[PDB]
Design an enzyme around this catalytic site. Structure first.
Site, short mmCIF file in Angstrom:
data_model
loop_
_atom_site.label_atom_id
_atom_site.label_comp_id
_atom_site.label_asym_id
_atom_site.label_seq_id
_atom_site.Cartn_x
_atom_site.Cartn_y
_atom_site.Cartn_z
N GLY A 1 2.67 2.33 11.19
CA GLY A 1 3.61 3.05 10.81
C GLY A 1 4.52 3.39 12.10
N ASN B 1 1.20 -1.60 0.25
CA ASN B 1 -0.42 -0.20 0.03
C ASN B 1 0.80 1.50 -0.35
OD1 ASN B 1 -2.17 1.89 0.66
ND2 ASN B 1 -2.41 1.37 2.49
N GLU C 1 -6.59 3.25 8.52
CA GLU C 1 -6.37 5.48 8.57
C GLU C 1 -7.80 5.68 7.90
OE1 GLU C 1 -2.86 5.49 6.11
OE2 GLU C 1 -1.26 4.29 6.93
N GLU D 1 -3.72 -6.09 10.73
CA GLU D 1 -3.12 -5.01 11.31
C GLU D 1 -3.69 -4.60 12.10
OE1 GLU D 1 -3.39 -1.86 7.53
OE2 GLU D 1 -1.52 -3.13 7.45
N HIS E 1 -9.20 0.09 5.56
CA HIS E 1 -7.39 -0.34 6.57
C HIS E 1 -8.09 1.24 7.55
CE1 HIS E 1 -3.86 1.47 6.94
NE2 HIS E 1 -3.58 0.30 6.04
N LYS F 1 0.03 4.24 -0.35
CA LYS F 1 -0.58 5.49 0.82
C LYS F 1 -0.10 6.75 0.09
CE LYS F 1 -0.28 2.78 4.64
NZ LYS F 1 0.03 3.32 6.28
N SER G 1 4.25 -2.15 10.51
CA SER G 1 6.00 -2.60 10.51
C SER G 1 6.72 -4.07 10.14
CB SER G 1 5.67 -2.26 12.51
OG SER G 1 5.92 -1.05 11.89
#
Lengths: 248, 249
Positions: A171, A9, A95, A165, A93, A11, A211
């Site tokens: 991140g 991804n 985010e 995730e 996702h 982003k 990560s």
């Protein structure tokens, strides 16, 4: 055997130039023949990537909406993706669930609509640090999965990859241990067995994200219920190739 | 006044490669008033195709963008990607993004400042709902939404802004504002600009109307003195978009 699956991804990153360089790096890489590879560029770069990327890596969109067309300024439809020859979409996702408030039902509606219009779906699920510390990991991911399971049919699942995730791993540099990841993947697969079917549970890929990098992907890939990875920032760097090759 | 007539076409979530080629071909072959500034806004996946193939006197807009240069914002497009693709405009604050996707005034204002600071021009959408008008809040709402932008940008930044007033009850409903209703709000917006930014920004900023505009009602609306053009939704996918571009000749 479930085919090993690596999604990248990108982003909100990239220019024409850096994306041409990145596609060049992939087109020259020696990739494990046994990994299914997908990359997800920004929407505006989907034509450039689909035109120039090696055909054994498929292309995904990072989001889409729930209707075929209409007065939805700023949204992309699954029909546009199909028109452009984009076969995959990332949905749910973290985010989008957090920053843009996308609900479990909203993600479910997108998934059903994408699957009914020919797309394959990387479905993202995962708990926050607070939900984990409260002992709620399984309750949260199964709630997120159940919203989808209640809307799609048993055969739809063949076009779904589940990306677990942990929000606390995205991140942050705090990767789940192989034992932590395995525990949740095993529990997701058990949930699929008891609420959809044994066949869906056995064949659906459950990939891990958060990560993942060159140094930790090989041990994670050894786990029996980890079927691959969803990669964020490392997907823009050459170590994306090592992650594709995590089973070697 | 010296305000150049401005007609924006917002395609929203509509189009395929073939239907967009036909739309662009129709625009490329049209006779367009030379005094109209025209902007069209395709879905982001079609920005390259439209930018490559559209007559260059019509500029291209994205329908949204985010607040940061780059980063971990799955599904978002940045201002930098737009400039890299040669996309000079962006529509921000459209009602559908305020109501369906929860964009706040401040969030719109952040996007507006960030776009302007990275070389974009902005069509800034504001407007009141039916229920707000029924509580006598039309002026309060639209000036509140404008003030969030005004508090962040400089007086010179306004030269790259076009304000689109869209009464939410007129969007896609077939219930267009009358010329008097539109003119009343446009006058108030311009008064707000003179009182809170400057006389010069008030005199020069285009304030355009949106809401159920079509070939049959655009000419009378364009006669109102504080209406400087149109933001066109559904009709921008049809040939009569040309007639709206030509509403002053």
């Amino acid at each position: 055997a479930r085919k090993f699956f690596v999604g990248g991804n990108w982003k909100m990153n990239g220019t024409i130039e850096s994306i041409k360089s990145l596609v060049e790096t992939l087109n020259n890489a020696e990739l494990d023949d046994n990994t299914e590879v997908v990359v997800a560029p920004p929407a505006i770069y989907l034509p450039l990537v689909r035109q120039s990327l090696r055909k054994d890596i498929q292309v995904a969109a990072q989001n889409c909406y729930t209707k075929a067309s209409g007065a939805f300024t700023g949204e992309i439809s699954a029909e546009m993706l199909k028109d452009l020859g984009i076969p995959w979409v990332i949905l749910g996702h973290s985010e989008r669930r957090q920053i843009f408030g996308e609900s479990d039902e909203f993600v479910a509606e997108k998934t059903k609509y994408a699957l009914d219009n020919g797309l394959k779906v990387i479905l993202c699920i995962g708990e926050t640090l607070e939900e984990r510390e409260a002992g709620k990991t399984m309750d949260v991911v199964t709630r997120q999965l159940k919203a989808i399971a209640d809307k799609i049919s048993e055969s739809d699942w063949s076009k779904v990859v589940i990306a677990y995730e942990p929000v606390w791993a995205i991140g942050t540099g705090k990767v789940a241990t192989p034992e932590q990841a395995q525990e949740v993947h095993a529990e997701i697969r058990k949930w699929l067995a008891e609420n959809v079917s044994a066949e869906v549970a056995e064949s659906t890929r459950i990939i891990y994200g958060g990560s993942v990098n060159g140094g930790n992907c090989k041990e994670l890939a050894k786990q029996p219920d980890i079927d691959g990875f969803l990669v964020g920032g490392a997907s823009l760097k050459p170590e994306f190739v090592d992650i594709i090759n995590a089973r070697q």
